[PDB]
């Protein structure tokens, strides 16, 4: 099951262009450069993930280009203020295809605790979001888990190989949600450690 952007369609995938699509998706997902965009405390945990104690460099996501042209992924990590929302939209428009968006934190997800006059209630109001991370702030390993989720999201999506041959629309897989996938093991939890110890 896939979704078009130029519509809910099926999988269109001879065998040579199939292997080409898997190789292109593998190269895209194994080399994702985030854009260095500092908004709020969620970016502090993002750069905490960037340091040596968590090693986001292992996933090939450590180049951290200061220009949106050289970046493939926008990590909106912070509150979406009304003054900063045109800046976010302009920086998103400056990025080039393929582009993916990770919302980091409850502010970027939905506005979070700041349902206030000067905060846009979520970055999905004006730019599309690929991965959402709950948390305030999400811990750095949660950001790396969201990076892995984006990696398997990219790994089966279909994009044109060239701009002159083939269908130019972009396919995005309707993935099974992590909630229903993890419900089998989350409900079975019965006992946890008592909060009186270290």
């Amino acid at each position: 099951d896939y979704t078009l952007t130029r519509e809910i369609v099926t999988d269109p995938l001879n065998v040579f262009m199939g292997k080409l699509n898997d190789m292109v998706n593998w190269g895209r997902k194994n080399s994702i450069w985030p854009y260095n965009f500092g908004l709020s405390c969620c970016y502090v945990e993002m750069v905490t993930s960037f340091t040596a104690v968590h090693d986001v460099a292992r996933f090939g996501a450590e180049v951290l280009r200061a220009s949106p042209r050289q970046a493939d992924l926008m990590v909106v990590a912070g509150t979406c203020f009304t003054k900063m929302a045109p800046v976010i939209q302009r920086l998103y428009d400056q990025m080039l295809e393929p582009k993916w968006v990770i919302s980091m934190g409850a502010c970027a997800n939905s506005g979070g605790m700041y349902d206030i006059y000067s905060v846009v209630q979520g970055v999905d109001k004006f730019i599309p979001v690929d991965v959402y991370i709950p948390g305030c702030p999400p811990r750095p390993e949660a950001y790396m888990q969201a990076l892995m989720l984006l990696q398997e999201s990219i790994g089966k999506e279909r994009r044109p190989l060239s701009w002159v041959v083939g269908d130019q629309g972009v396919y995005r897989a309707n993935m099974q949600s992590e909630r229903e996938r993890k419900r089998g093991e989350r409900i079975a939890v019965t006992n946890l450690r008592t909060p009186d110890e270290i």
């Binding site: 295809e97 994009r159 044109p160 190989l161 060239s162 701009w163 002159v164 130019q168 972009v170």
Partner: protein
């Protein structure tokens, strides 16, 4: 000699393959993938100092490959050359021509 024409062919192949490889990777990058203040005069001064000292450097380049054949007389001549060059450099430094921040 066979060695010299072979070396010329190898150098020509190196130049051609390098230029064509960068051109081919530019073509491949263009082919693949779908679609959707007044400058001060200190830059001129620095570049002009580079030009003048580069010509004096070319004179020193010519001298350095024939130091043994020129003897001590060539050493004396290059000593006056380098002393004049260093006097010019000291003159440039002491008048603030090479200082960026005033």
């Amino acid at each position: 000699s066979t060695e010299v024409i072979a070396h010329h062919w190898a150098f020509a192949i190196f130049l051609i393959v390098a230029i064509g490889l960068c051109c081919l990777m530019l073509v491949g990058g263009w082919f693949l993938g779908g679609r959707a203040l007044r400058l001060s005069a200190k830059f001129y001064l620095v570049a002009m100092f580079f030009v003048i000292f580069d010509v004096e450097a070319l004179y020193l380049f010519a001298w350095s490959t024939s130091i043994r054949e020129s003897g001590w007389v060539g050493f004396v001549e290059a000593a006056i050359f380098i002393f004049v060059l260093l006097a010019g450099l000291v003159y440039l430094v002491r008048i603030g021509a090479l200082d960026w921040t005033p």
